[PDB]
């Protein structure tokens, strides 16, 4: 038979009150990855995969090998919009940034004229570590969290190797 995908999609995507899977550059490390973009509500989501050795699915009256579980999780375009400037230091990319509330979000890391800032980004990235420290306390992921919470944002940015000085010493 034809390959069946097992997705976990946010509850809202269902209602109309339009959906495109666009291959975009991996901001941390990699030439690319899958990203699902909401065109009606105008939002971004990343696609992660659960792959574990020796699993398969019984989907209705069929078997699907692998046992993959795909997730569409809300993405902060700030991580994805970082690579357009990141290379300066001082394919589907187009539709990706062009959305409402873009310029107001852009004034966090960078700034007609747009200019990248290393100072604001370090302040923003540090706030995220604490923001994800709150979640790690609520979700209870098994102080010591300082090193762990910093690490989670590293899988979303290559400037975390430049933020290894931001590890222990904040910046």
């Amino acid at each position: 038979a034809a390959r069946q995908l097992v997705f976990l999609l946010p509850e809202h995507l269902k209602d109309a009150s339009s959906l495109l899977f666009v291959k975009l550059a991996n901001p941390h490390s990699g030439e690319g990855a899958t990203y699902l973009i909401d065109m009606c509500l105008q939002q971004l989501f990343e696609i992660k995969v659960f792959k574990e050795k020796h699993h398969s699915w019984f989907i209705n009256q069929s078997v699907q090998s692998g046992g993959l579980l795909h997730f569409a999780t809300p993405m902060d375009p700030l991580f994805l919009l970082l690579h357009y400037l990141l290379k300066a230091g001082k394919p589907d990319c187009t539709l990706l940034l062009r959305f409402p509330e873009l310029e107001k979000s852009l004034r966090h890391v960078t700034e007609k004229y747009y200019k990248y800032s290393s100072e604001k980004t370090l302040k923003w990235l540090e706030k995220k570590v604490n923001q994800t420290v709150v979640a790690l306390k609520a979700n209870n992921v098994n102080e010591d969290y300082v090193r762990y919470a910093h690490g989670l944002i590293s899988d979303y940015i290559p400037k975390e190797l430049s933020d290894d000085l931001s590890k222990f010493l904040k910046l």
């Binding site: 038979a1 034809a2 390959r3 069946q4 995908l5 097992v6 997705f7 976990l8 999609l9 946010p10 509850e11 995507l13 269902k14 209602d15 109309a16 339009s18 959906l19 495109l20 899977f21 990343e46 992660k48 659960f50 574990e52 050795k53 020796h54 699993h55 398969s56 699915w57 019984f58 989907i59 209705n60 009256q61 069929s62 078997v63 699907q64 090998s65 692998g66 046992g67 579980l69 997730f71 999780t73 809300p74 993405m75 902060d76 979000s105 995220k128 923001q131 994800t132 709150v134 979640a135 790690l136 609520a138 979700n139 992921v141 098994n142 989670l152 944002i153 979303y156």
Partner: protein, 116 residues
């Protein structure tokens, strides 16, 4: 690859089992002839068998505020809809500190990372 909420809004219920084994080829199968009539209930989940091996199961819920879909293929439309699935383990029910139960904790954390 793109697809409207039409397939999503009108997707019919689907029954999913996550086996602790990989059936190397994708194909239709008589789950309702072999599998289903082997399934039994008890105080700690369900019991069933595959290729003569004892499996122990449990119903696992799709994360809160999330929806489960089966999608077949550009353009990609949804064939089934689920809100929970059966997670099978070999001889002993998969533990709470298992890879699967950890992945389901991802959307909850993903909301915090990507919060504006």
């Amino acid at each position: 690859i793109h697809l409207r909420p039409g397939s999503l809004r009108g997707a019919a219920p689907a029954k999913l089992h996550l086996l602790p084994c990989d059936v190397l080829v994708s194909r239709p199968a008589p789950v309702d002839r072999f599998f289903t009539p082997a399934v039994r209930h008890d105080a700690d989940g369900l019991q069933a068998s595959f290729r003569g091996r004892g499996l122990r199961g449990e119903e696992v819920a799709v994360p809160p505020g999330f929806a489960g879909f089966v999608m077949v293929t550009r353009l990609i439309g949804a064939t089934g809809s689920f809100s929970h699935f059966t997670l099978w383990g070999l001889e002993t029910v998969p533990g709470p500190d298992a890879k699967v139960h950890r992945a389901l904790g991802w959307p909850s954390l993903a909301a915090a990372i990507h919060a504006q």
